Symmetry: C3
Subunit: 114 residues, 3 copies
């Protein structure tokens, strides 16, 4: 599972432990071992959401499976919750794109997961 968050929130406002918390909570949510979870936080971005530049985030979650109607609603509750708590971003200023990747289309360690 790979989670990326792009946000206009300043780097200094990203708290200690945020990548670790994301990793741990994604492990819990996706059922995957933390050793295979990747997280990427990109602060200080030039962004607007609804035409304004109050704190916002554009995110993506890629996963081989564990993507679907109910699962994505659960991820969104979790991830918006963390963004609101830790980065003070309102959940209604967050988009998260979910991608169900075919194992043959994810490269790792000189090969793919197929």
């Amino acid at each position: 599972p790979m989670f990326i968050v792009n946000t206009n929130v300043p780097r200094a406002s990203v708290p200690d432990g945020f990548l670790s918390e994301l990793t741990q909570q994604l492990a819990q949510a996706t059922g995957k071992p933390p050793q295979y979870i990747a997280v990427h936080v990109v602060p200080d971005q030039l962004m607007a959401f609804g035409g304004s530049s109050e704190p916002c985030a554009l995110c993506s979650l890629h996963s081989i499976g564990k993507i679907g109607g109910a699962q994505n609603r659960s991820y969104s509750k979790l991830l918006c919750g963390l963004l609101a708590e830790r980065l003070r971003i309102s959940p209604d200023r967050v988009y998260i794109n979910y991608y169900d990747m075919n194992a043959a289309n994810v490269g790792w360690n000189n090969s793919t997961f197929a």
Copy 2:
């Protein structure tokens, strides 16, 4: 709809108003209220297009619907037009990836659009 542009054009060459113009014009082009539209501009990137580091851009437009053959051609004319006028990037050094997102695969406000 979410629009991201990554470019090697420096920050100082991004004109005032650019995020707002992108928002307005995307609202016009997609027929969606600007409150729905997110835009993200990433300047100063280490990029090459055709092996050359002349100004270029790699972009994406994700949308829940309003993606298709003719529509994408129209978006490309619009967006290349804006990048050429505002950032002085040649349209033949622009790629724009279009993604038709399922509502269930876009999170927002603790849930999804499903």
Copy 3:
């Protein structure tokens, strides 16, 4: 074909000529003229892989065709090879997402490749 590398490796550790090398190597690998190839390297990122912030990379390869089970395995060996050789990133700390793009969903030069 468009190749993006996001990494926590510092900018200074990205060798001169890396973008050109990626371009030439992808050109050979995809059997496409280098004029078609775009590359984007993003160093100094705040990233974790497996809960660790040792050097790692999250990458994507978008291509109109030339994506598939065996081809992706070949790309992974190639690209992990380059990342290990040039950026000193272990191949088991690299993910590469492969995307087979429809021609109608790639904008270029005021239109699309449709």
